[PDB]
Design the sequence.
């Protein structure tokens, strides 16, 4: 379960090359809360589709708060 | 937030800017990796 | 007390299905397997899960072969066969507690298997094999659930016009493909200097194209194309394509062991067209950039041919997502009401075994396991197999309208090899080791 976070930064290191540490903290805290959902009788499948849409709108709300050169 | 003083700070006037490809790809890779760890639902040991 | 072995074969086979069931469907859960070398892997394909289980118990050893038997007959729904056999034995324990013999249960399932295919026949929609448009829709629909689903619309028709070997190399892309009437190899013609030969005769070791340092130089004086480093898999196909035979001795080289070809050149693959021999063969040229892409490209077409083979034997189509399974679980409950003896209670237990497939897909789809199957029973009683489980959207929808289809042979073979294997377990009284 830890090696997933090792390859997490390797792909971020080649394309962007910065802020790879903050990528591991976001995913680390998401699973702490996601496991709490499973403790509340929530299947992981519904959590995956909800996270993908939360990530979809996250890029949109960023684009609606961008600044140009 | 002003990291040197510990207060709020207007980044448009202070100049704390960041690229678009940083915050966007970080949230995608962090969400995609967490889906992988949570997609795992078994443990086999030989 | 012979119950000591019949109870163990069930619990041994029950543990295999209880684990792999979570990987059911495209939206199934992955797994974390630890190999003996120390490294691990993350994969949901059930064929690789049980292949690495390294089972020892005889009851579980039969389930590994049960999955391999479905891979040859139908080629789809590999995990669905182990789950049915796992759920059937789970119900058999309820029967043995009542005082029923295992042999009584075997012949009772013969009636459930007989009436099981009948329920699928009335609901299935026959189709025309010659209509390639139906061959393309039936093939491209199921191909969307594979790994390479974006390039499925272009790999499907390459299997239509060919119906078969698949050549693959690095470089290029997946979209470009070409059907070769003759044969193509993954080797080169080195160290020959001609590389283009008309009026070619082939003979596996007059003969201008040799398919096998001093021998490299002498064979070039007579202007003979030297092609070496050929594995055995190509020897079985070239013989049927162009009509060649092997020559294991220099004296055995004669005219009766050669072939013919109108063209044999290296356009680096050896495009050899114009077989001019009686036979039925074809080779598909596939391209790709990375090595992991071409390996999955072969499985995309090879799994596509399994659907074409399913339509030839069974020219019929059925709804997906456990849609016909609800009709199988409901209609068998009604047939048991008219039966007598120990067959009624056994046909009833055979129907409850199929109720777990849509309940498990409801689990892997995030829906409630109970409310999903309980609502579909009335939708099929009053309606038909149109409504079912849609895993793409995560809800109940019309499977025929959602563009999800599977052939009749996949669901039929999954139940025949499964029920026959359970009867093999019921016919076991005890096991002893020999030497």
Sequence:
């Amino acid at each position: 379960a830890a090696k997933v976070l090792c390859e997490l930064a390797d792909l971020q290191d080649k394309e962007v090359g910065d802020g790879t540490t903050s990528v591991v903290i976001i995913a680390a805290e998401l699973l702490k809360n996601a496991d709490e959902l499973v403790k509340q009788k929530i299947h992981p499948t519904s959590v995956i589709s909800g996270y993908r849409l939360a990530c979809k709108e996250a890029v949109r709300y960023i684009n609606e708060n961008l600044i140009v050169n | 937030l002003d990291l040197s003083n510990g207060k709020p700070r207007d980044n448009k006037q202070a100049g704390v800017f960041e690229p678009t490809i940083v915050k966007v790809k970080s949230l995608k890779f962090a969400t995609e990796a967490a889906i992988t760890i949570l997609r795992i639902d078994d443990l086999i040991k030989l | 007390k012979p119950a000591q072995i019949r109870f163990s074969n069930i619990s041994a086979a029950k543990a295999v299905a209880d684990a792999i069931r979570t990987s059911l469907g495209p939206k199934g859960m992955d797994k974390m397997i630890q190999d003996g070398k120390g490294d691990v892997t993350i994969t949901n394909d059930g064929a690789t899960i049980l292949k690495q289980m390294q089972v020892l118990h005889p009851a579980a050893r039969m389930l590994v072969e049960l999955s391999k038997a479905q891979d040859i007959e139908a080629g789809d729904g590999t995990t669905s066969v182990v789950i049915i056999a796992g759920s059937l034995l789970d119900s058999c324990t309820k029967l043995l507690q009542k005082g029923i013999h295992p042999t009584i249960i075997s012949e009772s399932f013969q009636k459930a298997l007989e009436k099981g295919i009948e329920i699928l026949t009335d609901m299935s929609r026959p189709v025309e094999l010659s209509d390639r448009e139906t061959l393309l829709n039936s093939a491209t629909t199921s191909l969307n659930s594979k790994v390479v689903s974006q390039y499925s619309s272009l790999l499907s028709p390459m299997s239509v016009n060919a119906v078969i070997k698949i050549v693959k190399k690095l470089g290029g892309t997946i979209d470009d493909c070409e059907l070769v009437e003759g044969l193509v190899l993954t080797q080169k013609v080195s160290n020959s200097g001609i590389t283009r030969v008309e009026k070619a005769k082939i003979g596996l070791i007059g003969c201008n194209v040799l398919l096998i340092d001093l021998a490299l130089h002498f064979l070039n004086k007579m202007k003979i194309m030297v092609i070496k480093d050929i594995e055995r898999e190509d020897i079985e196909f070239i013989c049927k394509t162009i009509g060649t035979k092997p020559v294991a001795h220099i004296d055995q080289f004669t005219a009766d062991m050669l072939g013919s070809a109108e063209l044999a050149e290296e356009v680096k693959l050896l495009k050899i067209t114009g077989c001019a021999s009686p036979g039925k063969t074809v080779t598909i040229v596939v391209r790709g950039s990375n090595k992991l892409v071409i390996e999955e490209a072969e499985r995309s077409i090879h799994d596509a041919l399994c659907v074409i083979r399913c339509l030839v034997k069974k020219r019929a189509l059925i709804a997906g997502g456990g849609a016909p399974e609800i009709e199988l679980a409901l209609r068998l409950t009604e047939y048991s009401r008219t039966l007598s003896g120990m067959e009624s209670y056994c046909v009833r237990a055979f129907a409850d075994a199929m109720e777990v497939i849509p309940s498990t897909l409801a689990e892997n789809a995030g829906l409630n396991p109970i409310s999903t199957v309980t609502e579909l029973r009335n939708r099929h009683a009053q309606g038909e197999k149109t409504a079912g489980i849609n895993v793409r959207k995560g809800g109940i929808s019309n499977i025929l309208e959602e563009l999800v289809v599977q052939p009749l042979l996949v669901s039929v073979s999954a139940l025949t090899l499964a029920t026959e294997t359970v009867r093999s377990i019921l016919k076991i009284d005890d096991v002893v080791n020999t030497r």
